Structure formats: C-alpha cells, structure tokens
Design a binder for this molecule. Sequence first.
Ligand SMILES: *[C@@H]1O[C@H](CO)[C@@H](O)[C@H](O)[C@H]1NC(C)=O
Ligand SMILES: *[C@@H]1O[C@H](CO)[C@@H](O)[C@H](O)[C@H]1NC(C)=O
Ligand SMILES: *[C@@H]1O[C@H](CO)[C@@H](O)[C@H](O)[C@H]1NC(C)=O
Ligand SMILES: *[C@@H]1O[C@H](CO)[C@@H](O)[C@H](O)[C@H]1NC(C)=O
Ligand SMILES: *[C@@H]1O[C@H](CO)[C@@H](O)[C@H](O)[C@H]1NC(C)=O
Lengths: 418, 417
Amino acid sequence: NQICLQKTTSTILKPRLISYTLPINTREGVCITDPLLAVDNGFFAYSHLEKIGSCTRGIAKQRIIGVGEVLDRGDKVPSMFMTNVWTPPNPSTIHHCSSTYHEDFYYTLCAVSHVGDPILNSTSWTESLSLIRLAVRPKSDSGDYNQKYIAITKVERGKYDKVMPYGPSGIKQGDTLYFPAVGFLPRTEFQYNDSNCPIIHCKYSKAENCRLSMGVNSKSHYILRSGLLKYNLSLGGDIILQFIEIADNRLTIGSPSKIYNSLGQPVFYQASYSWDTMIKLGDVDTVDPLRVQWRNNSVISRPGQSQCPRFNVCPEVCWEGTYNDAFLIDRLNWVSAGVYLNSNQTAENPVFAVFKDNEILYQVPLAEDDTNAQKTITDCFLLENVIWCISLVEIYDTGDSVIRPKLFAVKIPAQCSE
Amino acid sequence: QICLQKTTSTILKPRLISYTLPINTREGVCITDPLLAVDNGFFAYSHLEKIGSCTRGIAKQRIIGVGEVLDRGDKVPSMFMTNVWTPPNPSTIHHCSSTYHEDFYYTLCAVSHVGDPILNSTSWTESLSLIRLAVRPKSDSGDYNQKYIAITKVERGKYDKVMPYGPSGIKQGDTLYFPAVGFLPRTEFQYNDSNCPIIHCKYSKAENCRLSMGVNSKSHYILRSGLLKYNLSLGGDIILQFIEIADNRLTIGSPSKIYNSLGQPVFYQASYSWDTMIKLGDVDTVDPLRVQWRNNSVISRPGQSQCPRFNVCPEVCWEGTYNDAFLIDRLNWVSAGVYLNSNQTAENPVFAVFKDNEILYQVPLAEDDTNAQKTITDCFLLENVIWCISLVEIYDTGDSVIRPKLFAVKIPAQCSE
Ligand SMILES: *[C@@H]1O[C@H](CO)[C@@H](O)[C@H](O)[C@H]1NC(C)=O
Ligand SMILES: *[C@@H]1O[C@H](CO)[C@@H](O)[C@H](O)[C@H]1NC(C)=O
Ligand SMILES: *[C@@H]1O[C@H](CO)[C@@H](O)[C@H](O)[C@H]1NC(C)=O
Ligand SMILES: *[C@@H]1O[C@H](CO)[C@@H](O)[C@H](O)[C@H]1NC(C)=O
Ligand SMILES: *[C@@H]1O[C@H](CO)[C@@H](O)[C@H](O)[C@H]1NC(C)=O
C-alpha cells in the first residue's frame, strides 16, 4: 500500500510503546544489554544479556534467547508474545548471537568464548560457533523439536583465520540460511592498495589510513571484514557453515550488519564503525558473492568521537560509532525507516525518521534532546493494509534501578496531512 | 501420595516461577489488586498498575490476561501469557473475578465511576460487565479472541446490589459460578442477636455480630458473600443470578474463592471480622450455597488492635487479609496455602501444608520482618507430582517497582530428605 512521500513538519508520526512479554523479573541493580531483535513472517526473535551492576563491565547473570509471535491485539495494533525461551548454563560464554527464521524455527547462531568478546581478544579466542534452534510454536511431548543445541564442527572459511556471526538477523533463500558475519584476516595477508584510499580532498589524511583503520586499532594482528555465513539445510546431516566475504566496493572495517528481505528482494545494512560515517545501506546486487549497491545517502550518519565524528568522510585511523540500522519500506521511491542519534560526538538524542537518499521526509524524537542512547534495530512489516515498524532502542543513563531497552511501534502514514 | 507426617525437615523447596507479561513502561510504580486463576492447564491473571502509592496512587493501566501453564522441559511448571486485554480508562474496572470454560476464560468485573463500591456503596450505581478472553487466540476470527459484554439482566433476590468479590470460580457443565457478594440494607437484614456467640466473652455484646456485618457499625448496607451464577446453555440474554451463602458460621461478606479439587467443589472465604480462624471447606450444596467449614484450629490471619489473630470473641471490626488455601488430599483433608505469621501486622509469609489441627511441614518465603498482604494459591498435577503456584503480595526494602512474587512449590511424596 501507499505511503506519504512529501517532506512535511506535520506530526504524522505517533510513536507508541509496544506491548511485549518476557520472563518477568524483580531483581534491582541490573543492566539489560547486547540486545537482538528479528521480525519475520509474523514471528519474532529476541535476545539479551542481563548483568549485575555496570552495563559495560558487570558480572554476567543471565543470557536469554527467546522467540514468539507478533500478533494483532484486537484494534489493528501489533503486540508481541514470547513463546519459547532458552538459557545457557554459563551466561558469560555466549557472544554475538544472530537470528534467522526459516520454517517452524528461528535458527540463532552464536559464538562461544572463554576469553570474553572475540573482537577485543582476537588472538586468544579459539574459534567456537554453535546454533540454538528454537521452535516459534512449541508442541508438547515432542523431542528435539522445541529446543535443540548444536555445536558447529565443520566451518569453511576461505582464506580467513577465524569467522564469526556479527549482527542481529539474516535471511532465508529456499533452504539456505544467511547470517551476517565477519572474517578475521591477518594484516600481513591483507591484500590492499594504499592508492585506493580517498584522501585527495583531505589535507590531513594519509594514504595508509584506510588500511590501518580496517582493524580495531592501527597495530592489531587481524583486520576485520564483513560478510555472510551460509548454512544450507538441504544437506540434512552434519551442520556445515561457509563464509562469504563482502565485496570491496566502499570497503570499511567489518562491523555488525543485517541482511533482510523487503518487498521481494534482499537489502543490506552495515554499521559505520570507522571514518566513512555516512549510512551504509542498499539493495543486494548478488548474495554469493555478496555485493551491495550502497545508496548515495547524504542525510543520515551516526555519532562518533573526536577523530571520526558525524558526517565525516576523510580517512582517519579510528574505531568508533554505533549500530543504527534502517528498513526499506518503498523501493520504487527508495524510502527507508529507522532510528538515528541526532548528535555529532555523543551517543544521544534518538529520532525515528523516514527518509530518501538526500532528504528526511518526516521524523519525530523518541526521547528528549539530552537523552543517552546506543544501538537501534528497526524491522518493518504489513499488518493488513498498513505498514508498521518495530524499533528496539537502547536507552541508558536514565537513573532506573533496571536499565533496559525500549521497544517502539510506529504506524507509517498514508496521508501527509494531520 | 504425599507426605502425611509432621516434620521439621526441609522437604519444601520454594522456587520463583517463570511467568511472562508485557514489560512495564516505567518505574515509581506499584502493581496491585492482583488476581490469579489456574484451571485445566491454563491460567488467568490481572493487575492494576498505579503511579506512586498502591492505595493512593494514580491509576495508569489495568490488564486482564490469560495463557498456558506448561512444562518447560525439566518437569517444572512455567507460565506463558497468550492474550491481553486493556480498558480505555484504568480507574473504572473493579473486583474482577475469573472462571474458565471451553477455550475461554471469562472474567467478571465491576464498572464504577465512584471508586471501590465497597467503600462507596450508596453512591455506586450497580454496573457489571464480562471480559471473555480466548486462552489460545486464532488469527482472522471475530469476537473469538476478545469480547466485551455489558450485563443488563441481573437477578439478585432481595439484595439491592450484587458484585463479584473474589479471584476465581468454577464450572458445572455449562453453568459458571463466580464468588460474589450482595449488598443488603441493614434495616432489611433478618438476624437474631441471641445467635451471637458472646457467652465465653466477658467484654462482648450481643449486638456485635450484626453490627460487624457491615464495613462499619453505622453503614447503610450489610455485606453477604455468595455466588453469581451464569448459565451458558441459554443464548439471547446474559442474565446473572445471585445466590446467598448459608448462615452457618456467618461473617461479613468478604473476598472468596470457589474451586474444584479431586472431583469436588471447595470454598474459601476471607476472615474480615472477629471470626479470625480460617474459613474453608467442602461445598455441601452449590445452589443454595452451603459450606462444611473445617473446624480448623491452627491457621488464622493478622488483624489489628480490635480483632487480632486467633480471635473468636465477637467484636465490631472490619480488618484482615485474604490468604486462601488449596485442598490437596480429601481422604486426610490436607490443604496448602500461604499464611502471614504475625498477630497484628501484615508480615512474614509462610508456605504451609496443614491438617485441621496441625501444620505438618512449612517454610518461610521471605524473612521474618517482611511486609506482605494478599496470597492466592492454586494446586494441580503435572506428570504425577502435585504442584502449587502461589501469588504473594510483597513490599520489600526500598524498591523502584513494587509487584507481587509468584512461587512454584513441589509437594513432597517422601517425608525424609
Ligand atoms: C584475553 O585472553 C587472555 C588469554 O591469553 C585472558 O587471560 C584474558 O583475561 C583475556 N582478556 C579479557 C579482556 O578477558
Ligand atoms: C544446497 O545443497 C544442495 C544439495 O547439495 C545443492 O543442490 C544446492 O545447490 C545448495 N544450495 C546452495 C545455494 O548452496
Ligand atoms: C550512486 O552513485 C554512483 C555514482 O554516481 C553510482 O555508480 C551508483 O549506482 C549510485 N547508486 C544508486 C543506488 O543510485
Ligand atoms: C555538527 O557538525 C556539523 C558539521 O560539522 C555542523 O554543521 C553542526 O552544526 C554540528 N552540530 C552541533 C549542534 O554541534
Ligand atoms: C441452564 O439452562 C438449561 C436450559 O434451560 C437447563 O437445562 C439447565 O438445567 C440450566 N442449568 C442450571 C444449572 O441452572
């Protein structure tokens, strides 16, 4: 169905807090973090890590991976009902979970670590991946159907030393699952020409900077490269993953990414964790090998820090930024919808926006002006005739005894008045 | 089989039950006026969310919810909400009661624009309504998932007003029975003062039983507990019929609960007056309602100055707390529920398993000085093990969000270990 395509300052966006169920807790002094949200085919996947104390550095208490239905509550407004919850024995070992819906199940692929975040301790992390398959509609007195845990032995990684899921959600093509992922490649093996680093209109940029900034720091062992992890269900036996590296068009440090189907075709978002701060988003040209037709988008960036702030395009050695994805809602006019932090060098001020490449059509703040915020994950879908979007937004520093993200439901307007 | 010996061993091991609800939108919030029903592998739940104080705060959201009680995987019960209803105005819905029948929970509530009808009886113009929620919603149906019915036809006998007054009721065939209360004018109230048992009570007057049948001694109406009957076999008119409880061991109308256990119906009525010992027993007849109260002598409830725990002398008092119990063995008449172990303050919740004249085994749920009010227990079989779920109102040390805690307790077979 149609949507509003005119640039207007009218209050036609009316964000509401969505009703969603989870295992209800009464523990104080807790931070809910490392969120994941996937919405596909009338079902959803959700995850978090509960920490006691600090969000960044508290003692890990509970990890949950959960799935359920996204339903019409009665008055043509979406709700969410959890149906199946999985919990590991040790909360601190599960990292970088990514989820993909196929049939009956949400197949979630996580990394396993005893050295913390593999990104921050790459050389130490011995590569271990595993898959939690949860059924979106549990059946009593079945076997493996409801919950099944699989340790991945067979991993096909090309020329990369290590590979890992790196993103919230992926897609299905037939019976082949594609998770967003990243490859770890030694700097010395990294094939790259310094002449291709666009420093030509940048007085204080060096040719070396693009290459140097392909790692988490300038003297890091590995470089990171985004990609897909492929999992073909048609071979119904031993589980075998194949890594696919992203094309080098507009290349940037491997960063959390998302692949999703919208209006029949696949679309890619990659976070801008470096100097190329403008939003990276576009239709998938080919999936294997992965190649994106990045939009020449000129109005959506992300907050940085001193070295690589918002709207930066000059190559610099920096690892900073925040994942703030967007969802294509109209391909003919290429309009998307997502939440961006309206701030240059601090993670603040979340704003839900609907935008073309060179224009924000209409928007609305979700919190105040001085409200702290990090990750934002948006997924959009039809509920009968009407396009709806669900957005999980990390909101911190609030003073709550329990810091947890807030989930918004937004109706996209058809008319441009009112 | 269950353990039938009086034991001090730690054979009860309460655990926090996993249950899902819509996450709250904020803090500085109190979750109150709870309801919990468990029946036929499904559950019904309700609360009112207030901003600020529990008794004084700003009403923000009312939810009525239903869902499945499932085996999570390791033979331990879990709860999954499936269907949630919310009124436009949170402050108008009062005294909800729930009963399950064929795919639906039917909850029955008071509609008031004057607050709690109990505290504003003369002002409350009698309005009742029914929210029917499906325990397993189906997409692209009509009324099936949620249906709201305003009750017009009410048959109340000689009572001026009637109202649901309790968390849950039972089904018999296609006839639903909610716990309820009738409002009767004092002047119309037929009662002989000679039947007031003051004979072993130096400082009790004959008038006191009658006077204490109202919320205060000069109140317009008296309250009398009972059932509201709703027969589904007739279409065309949602008529409710009120049934007054029998006058055996009569006491001020107070929140009550009717439930089936081991094939037969059982009644609990709260002790909101001077007769402070637990009121509980098998239903003799349902219409008219008559209970075979147990001569139970070990379970009471905290009161206040005038009518404390273990009081049996007639006094003019409206005080007490709803703390029900669930029969788990009729042959030996053993029940299970949570009581507040305190004489004159609402404190110290203890899960107990007891005969009429004996507490067999028990365990504290919180500390000794932990504040607590209402407790609702429902028990059921899982694989072949008896389980009990207990919703307990608790107010902890400084807490940002005050909400009740739901416990799951396995009843032991052996008396050792
Ligand atoms: C990184 O790995 C080492 C093992 O060489 C481990 O001892 C150390 O604690 C890890 N650091 C972090 C950030 O946990
Ligand atoms: C998946 O496996 C089947 C059977 O080996 C093969 O025919 C098919 O082409 C594979 N699909 C992809 C896209 O890898
Ligand atoms: C962006 O612009 C470049 C050069 O003008 C072009 O090659 C590319 O296809 C454009 N992308 C889209 C999707 O318009
Ligand atoms: C952010 O940076 C841009 C360009 O560098 C500038 O136009 C804008 O005023 C800055 N915003 C604020 C409010 O600091
Ligand atoms: C309910 O109504 C039906 C239809 O008249 C009747 O057969 C049945 O006995 C009634 N049930 C009760 C318990 O009142």
